[PDB]
């Protein structure tokens, strides 16, 4: 009950005559009324510092250039590949023929089959971009 008067950036120590004490360095309290401050996330290794820590906000991490964040709060870093590639365990590998990837991350997915709906292919697809189908036989020859 008495600890509620300690705001964010402090922790409550009832052994003090002035119970609300500010957080030590590398430490934060984001809510207030807490008996401790949490230790600032350090963005170590494959992590990088986006917003440095403060007394009231944890440090925010993003990944190093050649990586991309995954998970809540950038908890993970998956390696970036190029466009037209996908990430396999042996490294970044080009998309196989018939597949494409328009992102610097993820897997290759196949082209949309224009032949299934009876349409010719207007522009050739590539590793980076999908195909663009021509008109259906109903518009191309009957309307």
């Amino acid at each position, epitope marked *: 009950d008495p600890c509620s008067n300690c705001p964010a950036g402090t922790f409550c120590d009832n052994n003090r005559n002035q119970i609300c004490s500010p957080c030590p360095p590398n430490s934060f309290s984001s809510a207030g009324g807490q008996r401790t401050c949490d230790i600032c*996330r350090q963005c170590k290794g494959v*992590f990088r510092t986006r917003k440095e820590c403060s007394s009231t906000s944890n440090a925010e*991490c993003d990944c190093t250039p050649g990586f991309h964040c*995954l*998970g*809540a*709060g*950038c*908890s*993970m870093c*998956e390696q970036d590949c190029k466009q037209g590639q*996908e990430l*396999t*365990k042996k490294g970044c590998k080009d998309c196989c023929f018939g597949t494409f990837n328009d*992102q610097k991350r*993820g*897997i290759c*997915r*196949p082209w*949309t089959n224009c032949s299934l709906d009876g349409k010719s292919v207007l522009v050739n697809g590539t590793k980076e971009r*999908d195909v663009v189908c021509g008109p259906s036989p109903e518009n191309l020859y009957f309307q």
Partner: antibody
Framework: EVQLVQSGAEVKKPGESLRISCKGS????????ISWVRQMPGKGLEWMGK????????NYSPSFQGQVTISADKSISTAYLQWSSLKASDTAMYYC?????????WGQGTLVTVSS | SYELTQPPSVSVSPGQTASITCSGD??????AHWYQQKPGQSPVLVIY???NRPSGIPERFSGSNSGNTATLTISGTQAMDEADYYC???????????FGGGTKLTVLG
């Protein structure tokens, strides 16, 4: 904050049709795969298939090929898991997760319960 | 399609390390991811890409993957680690993800 909010619990009858949704907010919904995962009562996790909402490309595991339909209306950042006729064997918990391999976000899961 | 085998039950004593295997044909050619799940709660990943650990996961969680077995290792296992553990992998061949059968790690009390 990136979030995946799923539909409420469903209580259907055998033969009825059902479609649950998975609304993904806080990120570019079109360029992240959405995978649907099944978990029977007291059983493990079963990957059902994924979908890329950018072009609605869908994929399925052999256990669910031709059993369910996965769809995505990327104009409202929502993926779907659709049945045509529910069997009593379909009582389970259905999670949607973001990603093809690493599932870094999970919805709260939609419980379905088919019975007379 | 692809099948990943993990023992249904592994026990361990307080403070001693637990190992949980995930066996599949040439799983060592794929990235292995381990997910922890507790009653009434969505699965939360503990190890991704064989060995890497996400931020917020205790350093006692360990992972390796080679040959036909990926394994999750938990040093100094504490009572909070008693939960179901699922290994997972994605293979480009067929472009599907598969979960292991699940292992219930029991911390003996």
């Amino acid at each position: 904050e990136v979030q995946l909010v799923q539909s409420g619990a469903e209580v259907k009858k055998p033969g009825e049709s059902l479609r649950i949704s998975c609304k993904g907010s806080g990120y570019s919904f079109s360029t992240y795969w959405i995978s649907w995962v099944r978990q029977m009562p007291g059983k493990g996790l079963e990957w059902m298939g994924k979908i890329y909402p950018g072009d609605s490309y869908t994929n399925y595991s052999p256990s669910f090929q031709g059993q369910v339909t996965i769809s995505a209306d990327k104009s409202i950042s929502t993926a779907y898991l659709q049945w045509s006729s529910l069997k009593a064997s379909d009582t389970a918990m259905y999670y949607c997760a973001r990603g093809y391999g690493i599932f870094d976000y999970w919805g709260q899961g939609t419980l379905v319960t088919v019975s007379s | 399609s692809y099948e990943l085998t993990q023992p249904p039950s592994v026990s361990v004593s307080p403070g001693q390390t637990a190992s949980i295997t995930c066996s599949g044909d040439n799983i060592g050619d794929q990235y292995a991811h381990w997910y922890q799940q507790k009653p009434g709660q969505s699965p939360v990943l503990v190890i991704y890409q064989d060995k890497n650990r996400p931020s917020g996961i205790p350093e006692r969680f360990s992972g390796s993957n080679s040959g036909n077995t990926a394994t999750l290792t938990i040093s100094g296992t504490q009572a909070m680690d008693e939960a179901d553990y699922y290994c997972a992998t994605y293979t480009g061949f067929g472009s599907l993800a598969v979960f292991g059968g699940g292992t219930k790690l029991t911390v003996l009390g």
